[PDB]
């Protein structure tokens, strides 16, 4: 059964990048939306678009720089089987700071740097590079 | 723009599948291959033997136009099925024209009954007939000057199997294959059938309304085993064959050619 929506998102994105797909669509969720927004802010994607009322569909638009994809790597870290929660000091650095780590915090979902700046940790969703 | 889309549907509108629209201009001749271009993906490897008329020499130079045939695409590279088959549609149209006035008038010269019925030839092709049609009455053209010139007056046609019998004389006078498969049966009714593919044990001449014949390898000639059918007859040619044997059950009519 479908158990982890976010991870499914990330896999879809990965597969689109692999296959040189322009855009990747999937059912929408708030957490998914926020993640997409974070990615856009962090520039791994061009733009995201949710559409629909009863069952809305998130549609991300993937990014390709000099042929190859932008999202070099994208992994979940927290997962239903095994959750990961980090305190602000302990927060990670993806690719020695070049990549990002999406982290959900009390004040919303943000990149690891942003969280560090804020002064708070939380659940580590995914690394992106 | 939609320029191109409109053109695509235009060019759809100005071509059809069969060999109907005389469009291919002969753009290279060499012996033994003619080639055309009828607005298809590729040029046709035409034989010279589709295009010599009734005495053995060529008739069309560069720029000349005959339609070919279609509905089969790319055996690996190329485009067509041959154009004389197109001529068969014109012959069918001429034969149908009879219906209008109940009399199609051509020359028809029938010397001898291949399969009971005299063979009647229209300009290039020669078709085979059922017995009665050669003569309106018991006149029997065997006493007429050999290969005589009258006309063809249609007595009988099979309407799915191209067997057409016509009346040479007497100007004044004017599932489906397998249930009743007893027409060409009795022992030895000879037929005019185009061969389709030679499978190195066979030739597969099969013309008479969705049947299959095999003149396989043993007769074919008067040598038995060293023969290799491709050397000895043809590809795609109408020949002498007769039944010799019918299964109506396991649909194996085993024709012969040594006759």
């Amino acid at each position: 059964s479908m158990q982890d929506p976010i991870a499914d998102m990330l896999t879809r994105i990965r597969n689109g990048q692999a296959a040189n797909k322009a855009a990747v669509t999937m059912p929408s969720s708030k957490l998914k939306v926020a993640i997409a927004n974070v990615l856009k802010e962090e520039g791994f994607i061009e733009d995201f678009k949710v559409e629909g009322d009863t069952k809305p569909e998130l549609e991300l638009t993937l990014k390709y720089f000099q042929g190859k994809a932008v999202v070099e790597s994208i992994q979940r870290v927290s997962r239903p089987g095994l959750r990961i929660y980090k305190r602000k000091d302990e927060l990670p650095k993806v690719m020695a700071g070049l990549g990002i780590a999406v982290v959900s915090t009390s004040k919303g979902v943000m990149t690891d740097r942003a969280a560090r700046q804020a002064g708070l940790g939380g659940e580590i969703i995914c690394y992106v590079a | 723009e939609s320029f191109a889309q409109l053109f695509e549907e235009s060019l759809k509108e100005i071509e059809t599948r069969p060999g109907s629209i005389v469009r291919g201009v002969v753009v290279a001749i060499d012996k033994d291959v003619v080639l055309v271009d009828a607005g298809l993906k590729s040029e046709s490897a035409i034989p010279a033997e589709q295009f010599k008329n009734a005495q053995g020499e060529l008739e069309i130079q560069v720029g000349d136009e005959v339609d070919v045939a279609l509905d089969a695409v790319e055996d690996g590279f190329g485009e067509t099925l041959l154009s004389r088959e197109k001529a068969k549609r014109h012959e069918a149209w001429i034969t149908l024209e009879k219906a209008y006035e109940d009399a199609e008038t051509v020359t028809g010269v029938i010397n001898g009954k291949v399969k009971g019925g005299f063979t009647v030839e229209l300009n290039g092709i020669r078709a085979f007939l059922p017995g009665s049609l050669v003569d309106v009455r018991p006149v029997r053209d065997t006493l007429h000057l050999e290969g005589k010139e009258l006309e063809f007056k249609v007595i009988k046609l099979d309407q799915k199997r191209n067997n057409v019998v016509v009346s040479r004389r007497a100007v004044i006078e004017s599932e489906d294959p397998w249930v009743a498969i007893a027409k060409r049966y009795p022992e030895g009714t000879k037929l005019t059938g185009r061969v389709t593919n030679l499978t190195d044990y066979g030739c597969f001449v099969e013309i008479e309304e969705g049947v299959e014949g095999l003149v396989h390898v043993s007769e074919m000639d008067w040598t038995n085993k060293n023969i290799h059918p491709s050397k000895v007859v043809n590809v795609g040619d109408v020949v002498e064959v007769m039944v010799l044997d019918i299964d109506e059950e396991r649909r194996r009519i085993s024709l012969g050619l040594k006759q």
Binding site: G43, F65, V70, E72, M95, A96, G97, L98, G99, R113 | -
Partner: protein
């Protein structure tokens, strides 16, 4: 200007009607002390000829690597067939902490400071290939900025 290191040389056999024909394989690597690196794997009946071939092959098909000053830009993994390799940027003075063929390629590359372990197979040929792969895929800050449509200070 280019420096060249023959990593390994190995005798390989071919059985024939008479007996065993022996030959020699030479695995070399060359580099200019900067980003640029290239390995070559030559073969000949005699050793010196085989190493000569290895040098020739290495000299062509070289590959560039984006070095932050003496070390790498971030931890990087690279694999090839059995040899799976981890290598990690390190502070000036630490030197090349790496084993075997891997070491050699790093030195010619002109990296001076790395912490580096070869997991899995340590078959010199495969492991050097894996190293090269890890070095190639490694991208720089400017490169990622360009990829992502940002400035370097935005990425830090």
């Amino acid at each position: 200007e280019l420096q060249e290191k023959l990593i390994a040389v190995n005798r390989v056999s071919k059985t024939v009607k008479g007996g065993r024909i022996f030959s020699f394989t030479a695995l070399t690597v060359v580099g200019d002390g900067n980003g640029r690196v290239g390995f070559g794997y030559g073969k000949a009946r005699e050793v010196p000829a085989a190493i000569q071939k290895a040098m020739e092959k290495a000299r062509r098909n070289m590959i560039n690597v984006a070095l932050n000053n003496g070390t790498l830009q971030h931890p990087v993994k690279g694999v090839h067939t059995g040899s799976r390799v981890f290598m990690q940027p390190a502070s000036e003075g630490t030197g090349i902490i790496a084993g075997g063929a891997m070491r050699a390629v790093l030195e010619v590359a002109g990296v001076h400071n790395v912490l580096a372990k070869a997991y899995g197979s340590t078959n010199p040929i495969n492991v050097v290939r894996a190293t090269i792969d890890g070095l190639e895929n490694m991208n720089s800050p400017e490169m990622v900025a360009a990829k992502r449509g940002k400035s370097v200070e935005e990425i830090l």
